[PDB]
PDB file of C-alpha atoms and ligand atoms in Angstrom:
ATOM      1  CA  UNK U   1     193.347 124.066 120.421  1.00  0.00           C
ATOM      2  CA  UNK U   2     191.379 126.380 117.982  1.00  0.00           C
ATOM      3  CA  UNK U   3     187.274 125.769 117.825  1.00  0.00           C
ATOM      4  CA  UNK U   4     186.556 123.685 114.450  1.00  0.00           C
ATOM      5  CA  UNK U   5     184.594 125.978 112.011  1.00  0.00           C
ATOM      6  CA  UNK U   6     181.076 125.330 112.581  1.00  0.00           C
ATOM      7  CA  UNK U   7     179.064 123.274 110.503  1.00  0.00           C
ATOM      8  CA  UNK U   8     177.774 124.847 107.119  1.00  0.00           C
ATOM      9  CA  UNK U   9     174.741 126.587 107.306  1.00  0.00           C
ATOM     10  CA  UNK U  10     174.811 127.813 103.311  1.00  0.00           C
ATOM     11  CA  UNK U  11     176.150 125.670 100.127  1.00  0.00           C
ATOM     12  CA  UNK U  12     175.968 127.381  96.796  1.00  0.00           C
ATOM     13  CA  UNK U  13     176.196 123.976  95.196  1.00  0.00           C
ATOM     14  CA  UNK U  14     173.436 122.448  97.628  1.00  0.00           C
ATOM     15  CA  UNK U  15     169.853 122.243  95.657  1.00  0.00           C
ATOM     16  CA  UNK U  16     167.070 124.261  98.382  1.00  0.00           C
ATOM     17  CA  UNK U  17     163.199 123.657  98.824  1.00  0.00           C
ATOM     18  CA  UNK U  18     160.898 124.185 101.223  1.00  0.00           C
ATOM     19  CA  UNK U  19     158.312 121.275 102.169  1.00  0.00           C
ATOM     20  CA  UNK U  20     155.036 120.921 105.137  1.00  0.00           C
ATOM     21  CA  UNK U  21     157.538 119.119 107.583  1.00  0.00           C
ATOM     22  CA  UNK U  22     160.521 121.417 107.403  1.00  0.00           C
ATOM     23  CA  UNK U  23     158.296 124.763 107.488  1.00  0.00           C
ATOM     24  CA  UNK U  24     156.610 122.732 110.841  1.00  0.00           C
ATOM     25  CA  UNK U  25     160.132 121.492 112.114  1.00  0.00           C
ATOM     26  CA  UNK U  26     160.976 125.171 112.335  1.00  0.00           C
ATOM     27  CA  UNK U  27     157.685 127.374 113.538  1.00  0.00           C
ATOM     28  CA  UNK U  28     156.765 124.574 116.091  1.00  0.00           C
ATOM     29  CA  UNK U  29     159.398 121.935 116.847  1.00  0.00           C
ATOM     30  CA  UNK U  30     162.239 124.071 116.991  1.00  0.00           C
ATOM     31  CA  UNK U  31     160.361 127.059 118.268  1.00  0.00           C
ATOM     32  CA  UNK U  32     159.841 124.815 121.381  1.00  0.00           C
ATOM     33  CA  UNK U  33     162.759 123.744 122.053  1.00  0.00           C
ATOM     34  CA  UNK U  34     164.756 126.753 121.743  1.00  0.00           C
ATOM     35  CA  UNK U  35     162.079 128.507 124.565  1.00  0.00           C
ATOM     36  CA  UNK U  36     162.814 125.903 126.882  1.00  0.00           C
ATOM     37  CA  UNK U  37     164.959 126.884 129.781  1.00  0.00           C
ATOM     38  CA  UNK U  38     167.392 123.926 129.044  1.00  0.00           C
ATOM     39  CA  UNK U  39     168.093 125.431 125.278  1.00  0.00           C
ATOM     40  CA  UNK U  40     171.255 127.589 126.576  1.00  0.00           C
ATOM     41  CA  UNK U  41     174.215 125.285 126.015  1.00  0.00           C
ATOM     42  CA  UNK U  42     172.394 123.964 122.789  1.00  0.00           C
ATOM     43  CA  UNK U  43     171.484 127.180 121.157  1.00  0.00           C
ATOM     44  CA  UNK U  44     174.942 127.494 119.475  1.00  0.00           C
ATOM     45  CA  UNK U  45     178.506 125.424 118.003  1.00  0.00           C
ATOM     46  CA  UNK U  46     180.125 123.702 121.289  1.00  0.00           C
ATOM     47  CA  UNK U  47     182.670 126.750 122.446  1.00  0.00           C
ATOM     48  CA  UNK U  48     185.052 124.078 123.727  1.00  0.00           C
ATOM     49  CA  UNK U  49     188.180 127.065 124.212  1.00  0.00           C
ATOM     50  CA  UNK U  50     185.265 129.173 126.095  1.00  0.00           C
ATOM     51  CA  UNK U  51     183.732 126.196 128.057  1.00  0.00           C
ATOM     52  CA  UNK U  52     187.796 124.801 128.676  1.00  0.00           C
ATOM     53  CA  UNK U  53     186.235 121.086 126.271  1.00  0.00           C
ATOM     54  CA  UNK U  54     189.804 120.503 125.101  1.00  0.00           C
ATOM     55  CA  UNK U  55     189.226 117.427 123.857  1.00  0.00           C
ATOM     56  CA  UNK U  56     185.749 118.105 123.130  1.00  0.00           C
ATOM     57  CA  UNK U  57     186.721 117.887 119.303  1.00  0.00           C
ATOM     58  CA  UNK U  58     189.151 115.138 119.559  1.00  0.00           C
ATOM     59  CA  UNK U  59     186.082 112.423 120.933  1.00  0.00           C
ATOM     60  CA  UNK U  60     182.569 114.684 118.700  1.00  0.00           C
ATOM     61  CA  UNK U  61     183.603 114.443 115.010  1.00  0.00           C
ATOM     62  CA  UNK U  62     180.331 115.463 114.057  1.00  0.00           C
ATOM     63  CA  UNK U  63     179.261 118.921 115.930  1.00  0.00           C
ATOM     64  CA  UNK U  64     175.709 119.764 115.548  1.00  0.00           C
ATOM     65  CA  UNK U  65     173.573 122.523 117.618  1.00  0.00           C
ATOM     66  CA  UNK U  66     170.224 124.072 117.866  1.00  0.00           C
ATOM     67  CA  UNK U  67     171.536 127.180 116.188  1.00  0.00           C
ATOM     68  CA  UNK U  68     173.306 125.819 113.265  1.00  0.00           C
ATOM     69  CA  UNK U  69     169.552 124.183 112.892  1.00  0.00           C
ATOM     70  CA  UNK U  70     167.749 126.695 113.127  1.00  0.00           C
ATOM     71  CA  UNK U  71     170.180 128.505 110.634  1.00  0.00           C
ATOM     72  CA  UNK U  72     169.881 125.423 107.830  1.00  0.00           C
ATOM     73  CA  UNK U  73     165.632 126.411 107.979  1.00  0.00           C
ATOM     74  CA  UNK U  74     166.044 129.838 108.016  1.00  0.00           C
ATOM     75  CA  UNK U  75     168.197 129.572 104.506  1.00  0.00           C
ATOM     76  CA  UNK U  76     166.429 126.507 102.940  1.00  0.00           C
ATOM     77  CA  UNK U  77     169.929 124.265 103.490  1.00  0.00           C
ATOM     78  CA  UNK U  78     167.629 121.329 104.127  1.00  0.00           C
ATOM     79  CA  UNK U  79     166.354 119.285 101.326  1.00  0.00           C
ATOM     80  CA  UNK U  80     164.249 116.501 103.290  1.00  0.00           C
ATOM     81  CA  UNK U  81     162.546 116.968 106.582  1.00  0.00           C
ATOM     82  CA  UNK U  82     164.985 113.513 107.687  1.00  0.00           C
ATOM     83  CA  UNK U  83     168.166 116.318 107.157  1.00  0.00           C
ATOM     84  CA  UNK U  84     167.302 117.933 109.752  1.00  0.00           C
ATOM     85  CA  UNK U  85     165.796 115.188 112.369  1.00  0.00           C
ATOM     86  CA  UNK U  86     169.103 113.666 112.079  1.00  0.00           C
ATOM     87  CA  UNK U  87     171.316 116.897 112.682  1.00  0.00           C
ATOM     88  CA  UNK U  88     168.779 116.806 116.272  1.00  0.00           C
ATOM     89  CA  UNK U  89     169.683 113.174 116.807  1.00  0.00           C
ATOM     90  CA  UNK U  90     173.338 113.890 116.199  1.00  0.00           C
ATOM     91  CA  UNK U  91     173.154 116.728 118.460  1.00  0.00           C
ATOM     92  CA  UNK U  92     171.453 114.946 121.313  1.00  0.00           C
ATOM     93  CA  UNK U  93     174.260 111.683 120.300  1.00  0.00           C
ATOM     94  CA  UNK U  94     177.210 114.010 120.627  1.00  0.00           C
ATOM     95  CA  UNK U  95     175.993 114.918 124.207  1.00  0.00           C
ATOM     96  CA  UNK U  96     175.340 111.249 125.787  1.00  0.00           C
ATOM     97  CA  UNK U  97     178.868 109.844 123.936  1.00  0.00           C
ATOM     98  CA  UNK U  98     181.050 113.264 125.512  1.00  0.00           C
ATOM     99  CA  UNK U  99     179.276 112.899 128.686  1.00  0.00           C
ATOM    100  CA  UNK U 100     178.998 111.115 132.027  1.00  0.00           C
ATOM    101  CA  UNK U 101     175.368 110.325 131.997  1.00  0.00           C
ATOM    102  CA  UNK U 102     174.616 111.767 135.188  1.00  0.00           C
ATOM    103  CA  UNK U 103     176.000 114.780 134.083  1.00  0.00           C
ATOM    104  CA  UNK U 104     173.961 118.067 134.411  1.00  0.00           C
ATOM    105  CA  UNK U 105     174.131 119.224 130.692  1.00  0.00           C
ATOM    106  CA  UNK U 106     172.974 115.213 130.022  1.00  0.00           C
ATOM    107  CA  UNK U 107     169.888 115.299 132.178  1.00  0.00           C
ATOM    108  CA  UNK U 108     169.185 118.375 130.386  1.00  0.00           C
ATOM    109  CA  UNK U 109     169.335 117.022 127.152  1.00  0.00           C
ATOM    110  CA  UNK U 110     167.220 113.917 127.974  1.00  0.00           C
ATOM    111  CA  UNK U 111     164.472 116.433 128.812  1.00  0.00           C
ATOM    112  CA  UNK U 112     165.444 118.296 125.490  1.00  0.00           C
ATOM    113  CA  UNK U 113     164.918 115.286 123.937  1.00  0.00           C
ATOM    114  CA  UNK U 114     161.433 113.626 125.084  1.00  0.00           C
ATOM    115  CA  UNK U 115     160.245 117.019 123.939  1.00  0.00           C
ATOM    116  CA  UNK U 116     161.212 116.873 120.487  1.00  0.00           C
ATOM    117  CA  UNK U 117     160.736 113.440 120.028  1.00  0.00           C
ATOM    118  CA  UNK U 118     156.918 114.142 121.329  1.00  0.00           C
ATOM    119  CA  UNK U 119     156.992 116.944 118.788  1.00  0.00           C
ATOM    120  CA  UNK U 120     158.241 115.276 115.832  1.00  0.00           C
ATOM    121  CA  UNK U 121     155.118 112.514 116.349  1.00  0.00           C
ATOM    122  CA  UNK U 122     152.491 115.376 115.384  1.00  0.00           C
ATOM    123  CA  UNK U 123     155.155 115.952 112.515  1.00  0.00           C
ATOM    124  CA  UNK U 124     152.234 116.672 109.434  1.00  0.00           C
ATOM    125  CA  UNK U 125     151.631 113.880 106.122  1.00  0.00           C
ATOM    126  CA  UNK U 126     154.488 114.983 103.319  1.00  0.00           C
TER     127      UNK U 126
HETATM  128  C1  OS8 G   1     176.735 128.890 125.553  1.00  0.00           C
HETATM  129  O1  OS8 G   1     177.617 129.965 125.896  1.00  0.00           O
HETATM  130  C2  OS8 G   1     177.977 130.220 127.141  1.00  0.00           C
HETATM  131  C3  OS8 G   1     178.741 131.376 127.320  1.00  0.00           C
HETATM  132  C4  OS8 G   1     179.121 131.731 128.558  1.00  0.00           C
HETATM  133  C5  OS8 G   1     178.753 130.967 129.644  1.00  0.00           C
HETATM  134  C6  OS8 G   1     177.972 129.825 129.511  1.00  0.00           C
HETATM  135  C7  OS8 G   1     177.594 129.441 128.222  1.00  0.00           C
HETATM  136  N1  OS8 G   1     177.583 129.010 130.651  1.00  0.00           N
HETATM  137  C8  OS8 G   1     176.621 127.882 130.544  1.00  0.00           C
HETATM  138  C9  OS8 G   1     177.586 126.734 130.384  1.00  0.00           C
HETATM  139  C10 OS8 G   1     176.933 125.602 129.676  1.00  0.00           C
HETATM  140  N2  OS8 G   1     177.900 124.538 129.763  1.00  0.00           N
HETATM  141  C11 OS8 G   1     178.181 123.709 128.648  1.00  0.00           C
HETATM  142  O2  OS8 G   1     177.683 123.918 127.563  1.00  0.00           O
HETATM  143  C12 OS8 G   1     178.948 122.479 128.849  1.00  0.00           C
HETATM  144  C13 OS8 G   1     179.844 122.409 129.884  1.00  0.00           C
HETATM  145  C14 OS8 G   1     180.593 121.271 130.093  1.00  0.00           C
HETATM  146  C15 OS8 G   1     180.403 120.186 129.276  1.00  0.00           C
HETATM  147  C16 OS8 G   1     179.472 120.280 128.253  1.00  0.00           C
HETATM  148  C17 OS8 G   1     178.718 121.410 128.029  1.00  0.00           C
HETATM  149  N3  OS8 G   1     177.683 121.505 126.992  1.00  0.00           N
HETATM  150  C18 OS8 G   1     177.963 121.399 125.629  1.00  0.00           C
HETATM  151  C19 OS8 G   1     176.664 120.970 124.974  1.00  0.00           C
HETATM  152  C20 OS8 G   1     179.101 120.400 125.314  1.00  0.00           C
HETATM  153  C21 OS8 G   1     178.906 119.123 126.063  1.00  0.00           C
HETATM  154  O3  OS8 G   1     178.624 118.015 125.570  1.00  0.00           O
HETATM  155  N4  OS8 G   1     179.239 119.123 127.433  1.00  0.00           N
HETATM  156  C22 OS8 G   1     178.041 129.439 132.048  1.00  0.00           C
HETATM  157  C23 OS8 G   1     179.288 130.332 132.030  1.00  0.00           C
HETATM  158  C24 OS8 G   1     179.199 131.441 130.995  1.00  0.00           C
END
């Protein structure tokens, strides 16, 4: 099988603002995460043809990846700072359903996680 598309990252027909928590979720939460030395296999749409995932797209329905994130800040795709938590909590989702739990790539997003969740606590007041 063929890769799915990746997720949107642009919608003419979307309505785009900026607010406090989305401008932090991208110079500091994301920032962070994307630095740490776990980011690799997160930074980008799950290559399942590359990485030899087969039925990585039968069992995830709903892809979601650091860079596609980063992507929806950088062009304003997000309307609500909760947009973009939950494509995070998908992401992190995706990996504990596909995965055995002790799994490498699952220990590494556990860490990935209790970062961002810390993070997302010294989220600023809308
Ligand atoms: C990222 O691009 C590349 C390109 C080339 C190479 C690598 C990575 N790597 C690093 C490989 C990183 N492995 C994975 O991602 C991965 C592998 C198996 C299963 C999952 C895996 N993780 C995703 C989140 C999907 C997922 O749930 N489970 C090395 C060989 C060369």
């Amino acid at each position: 099988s063929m890769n799915p598309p990746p997720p949107e990252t642009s919608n003419p027909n979307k309505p785009k603002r900026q607010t406090n928590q989305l401008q932090y979720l991208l110079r500091v939460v994301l920032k962070t995460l994307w630095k740490h030395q776990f980011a690799w296999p997160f930074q980008q749409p799950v290559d399942a043809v590359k990485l030899n995932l087969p039925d990585y797209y039968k069992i995830i329905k709903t892809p979601m990846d650091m860079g596609t994130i980063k992507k929806r800040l950088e062009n304003n795709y997000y309307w609500n700072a909760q947009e973009c938590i939950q494509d995070f909590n998908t992401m992190f989702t995706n990996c504990y359903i596909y995965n055995k739990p002790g799994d490498d790539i699952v220990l590494m997003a556990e860490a990935l996680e209790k970062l961002f969740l810390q993070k997302i606590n010294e989220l600023p007041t809308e």
